[PDB]
Amino acid sequence: TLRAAVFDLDGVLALPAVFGVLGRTEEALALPRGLLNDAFQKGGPEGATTRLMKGEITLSQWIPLMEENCRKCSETAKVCLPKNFSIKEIFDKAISARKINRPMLQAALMLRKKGFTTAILTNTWLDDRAERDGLAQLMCELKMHFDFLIESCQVGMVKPEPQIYKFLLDTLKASPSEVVFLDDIGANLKPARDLGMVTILVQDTDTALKELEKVTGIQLLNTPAPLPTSCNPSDMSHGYVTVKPRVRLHFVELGSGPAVCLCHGFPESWYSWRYQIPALAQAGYRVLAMDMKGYGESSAPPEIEEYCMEVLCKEMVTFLDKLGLSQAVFIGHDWGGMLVWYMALFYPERVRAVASLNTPFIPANPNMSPLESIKANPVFDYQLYFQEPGVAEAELEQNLSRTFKSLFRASDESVLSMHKVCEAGGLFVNSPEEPSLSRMVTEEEIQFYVQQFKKSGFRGPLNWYRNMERNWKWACKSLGRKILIPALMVTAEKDFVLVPQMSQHMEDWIPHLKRGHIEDCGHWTQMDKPTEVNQILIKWLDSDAR
Amino acid sequence: TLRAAVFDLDGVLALPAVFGVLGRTEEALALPRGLLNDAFQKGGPEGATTRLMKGEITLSQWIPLMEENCRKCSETAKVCLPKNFSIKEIFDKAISARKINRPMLQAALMLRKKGFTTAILTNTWLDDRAERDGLAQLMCELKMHFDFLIESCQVGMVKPEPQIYKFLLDTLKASPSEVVFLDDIGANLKPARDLGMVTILVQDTDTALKELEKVTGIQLLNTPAPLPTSCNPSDMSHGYVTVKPRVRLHFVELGSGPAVCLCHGFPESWYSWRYQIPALAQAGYRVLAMDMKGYGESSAPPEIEEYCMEVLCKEMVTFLDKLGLSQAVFIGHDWGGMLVWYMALFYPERVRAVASLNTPFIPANPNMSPLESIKANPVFDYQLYFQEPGVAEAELEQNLSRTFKSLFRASDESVLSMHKVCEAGGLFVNSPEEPSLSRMVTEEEIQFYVQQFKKSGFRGPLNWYRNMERNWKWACKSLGRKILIPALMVTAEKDFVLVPQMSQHMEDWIPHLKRGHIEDCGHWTQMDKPTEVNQILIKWLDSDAR
Ligand SMILES: CN(CCO)c1ccc(Br)cn1
Ligand SMILES: CN(CCO)c1ccc(Br)cn1
Ligand SMILES: CN(CCO)c1ccc(Br)cn1
Ligand SMILES: CN(CCO)c1ccc(Br)cn1
What we know:
The structure is a homodimer.
Chain A: E1 4-7, E2 14-15, H1 21-28, H2 35-41, H3 48-54, H4 59-76, H5 87-97, E3 99-100, H6 102-113, E4 117-122, H7 133-143, E5 148-151, H8 152-155, H9 162-172, E6 179-183, H10 186-195, E7 198-201, H11 205-216, E8 237-244, E9 247-254, E10 259-263, H12 276-282, E11 286-291, H13 309-323, E12 328-333, H14 335-346, E13 351-357, H15 370-375, H16 381-385, H17 391-398, H18 400-407, H19 421-424, H20 443-456, H21 459-463, H22 468-475, E14 487-492, E15 514-518, H23 525-528, H24 530-544
Parallel strand pairs in A: 1-4, 1-6, 4-5, 6-7, 10-11, 10-12, 12-13, 13-14, 14-15
Antiparallel strand pairs in A: 2-3, 8-9, 9-11
Helix pairs in contact in A: 2-4, 13-14, 18-20
PDB class: hydrolase
Keywords: serial crystallography, drug discovery, fixed target, room temperature, microcrystals
Assembly: dimeric
């Protein structure tokens, strides 16, 4: 029967309540009990604070009116306010201390996942202080998780006026008995309850959550840790840059701060970074997640030599030039990781810092052809199969749904033997026609990749493997160099192709290399262990790339 | 006969020459004359410096090799190096001090405008120092002005080896007698001259420029100040954000640093900021130049109410939310300027700073309808003409070339009377069918706007004028507020519609308002006086929006 949940911001979604700092300021400054709370409510509906909450005046205009109220209240109480008494200082510290109440936000996110319509209904102000960015950042993090945000200063109404509850019901398209309303101020619940809404008085979070569980029949407390926030492709800013007449690169962009370029592997997309993009932007970075050349909405020319590392790296430099970025942090995975090590070796001035997931830096051997080194390792047999143009394309393009369902699996769900691929005659020869869905991905996520590969097929992506000799000759020019800029290597325990053991001599070439290791993680690092990848990247970015 | 000009970077396009700091370091540290220059060239083609210039090793690997060379040279000279002697400190200070030689860059830009192919051919290194960004920024500013940039460390060859000159001629597709070559090092000219190229030894800039003038027949010295760098639309990064199901906003993006959002007026485009975009990005800002709703590649729904200020401002807030920007500096002109004042009044937390070109902030009068205020001023008569849907569209869409040629004119070139528009029956009734081209714009620039307005016509743009009453009712909610965030008002002397006198009472509402004034400037501020607009905005951004 319940289908909507409304939360207050102050004292419910964000703690501590700014209204609660008045009480602690009185105790600390030895002022009479309730003095600051009386100055705050001085005048009722015609008072300065109601004008502030309705949007009539801004926070900076209200501050000197609250100071007059503090002096008028002190005169009647026969007391004096300290010499260094400042409403501005008190409110700046209170607003700054207020952080998201993670268990409450998690309960709102869980209710929304179970079909509920969620909203924030709050009494708030137009913040024009020099420190207003701190509040703006808080509202941005919260608003993306709610269907509606109704702020008093924008609608010209305040709680507890009954018109704001009528406006709320109209916005929700719901009747009062279908709505749960959470607030920490008793007076604000009274009108919601007169209409017939379920009300919860929030004193402590745990008791409020227990009441919320009992009334919704959904478990909110003691539940498992949720996955990080993912991207909705239709909500992203899409960017397009022409790097050369026939080549245009597509990317998705989120955040402000130092530029971080994400480079996916084979056969993937910018969408393989869906769990890292919101996390990295929230950490204070401007994230650019590319569709590499040959993929998705980026150009996919047919010529093999359009995908050799020298051309790919030069186009990435042109990409930074056209965007007006002197530097970017480069983070790659699989083929993208191979590219980011070569960006650091050939264009160090354009690379702020470099990180690779799974892909180690392996220097070229001038005495041995790379095609002969691939034969020496039986797990790289699928790369010999990828050499002849047209062969692997026909198999991989035959059934796109089967291709992605067979590839994107956790280490214990594997359905492909990566060795004896050539001898067997294919990649999917001993594979089921209808593979089960992996616990790592949803059907909707698989369909995104299917839609992307319907456009240009596998020719461009497979050409990344068909320049072994050209790449070898190019890399041989860098054998005398070392990587002396900040660098991170992240290994994945259960990647049976790019094994952690293949990275063990990297310190000889990158002496100050930092490391990360992920246990129980397969090849598809980003979607296998997203919380762990995020934590490793954010910690390294904050210390070495800033 | 001459058709190509090649310049060296160090000592020619950038001064002072890093190679010249060795001489001044010797004089300051009382070291024997030429000691540091001998350590620098120690070994010839097999020496550390040649390996550095060929790209074999990076700058950080070369530093300890140059220190050994400094000690070996001091042993033979029977002298001692000071206690705090550091090659790293000497090179960091030398690279940092090197700035663009503006008269030389201006001469290269002039030669390129006259049909010459220009190139930089330089002996340079792979910079991996922690301070490498400074060099990266320098190379980015320079490379956009040249057809080719050939760096020794990328091609594996150095000057004076004859193969680098052969490689240069092949890249230029020119024979030696068609090439002018400028270098400050005599030894580097010798191979160019043996091939038959015209060579200029650069000791001082003025004498080199006089020699260059005599040999090309083009005046380079004493010439007028050139216009700021403009945008080539096909070289920009284009971004697209869906703010609501039927509405997608297009923007162009350049630079890194604090976000600056540019909002054009009627009937314009993101292209009206072509002279500000490279200047603002070079100053250290991330520039987002919008196609406002109804224009160019942004959505243009037909409904009138889709263009009222309340909807337009809310969509600009959603635009920041989808890009992950908590704040942006908002700069507007004409209708865009009207929008940026309302963004500051209703969403101050999202606005870092606000600037308007020509458009003053005029508060709503609750006693007077805005339609009656427009009749009181005869110069706003064209706005009454714009009220009836379909009428102004038919006239403005009839001949697009004529429409833009008649509108985009300097103050002394006007061909339209803005009063008695309704009585005359149109805007172009007493206007020439084939107006002359204004000195402000080229034919190519006019054609860009023609192409943009061929897509959605004038309905969307004209709807910005058809919400007078709705905007008035909305603005009346903000009559009790003041603008207390950083603000700039720039007036244009010869704007006969948005006269500077209309801004005189703005200090009552924006007490800390900063001002700018442009003499001999008409309505089309950005393209009329681009150098002056840039200087005013950059100075204000550096002091108030950072
Ligand atoms: C990134 N990979 C594994 C592709 O499946 C890679 C990179 C370089 C070479 Br050589 C071989 N494999
Ligand atoms: C690179 N590929 C696709 C080969 O068809 C790959 C890599 C790791 C794992 Br596990 C599976 N496939
Ligand atoms: C920006 N302008 C001039 C348009 O030509 C403007 C703005 C608001 C009102 Br009301 C009238 N004109
Ligand atoms: C806003 N317009 C277009 C009216 O057709 C305008 C503004 C200033 C000058 Br000058 C000319 N036109």
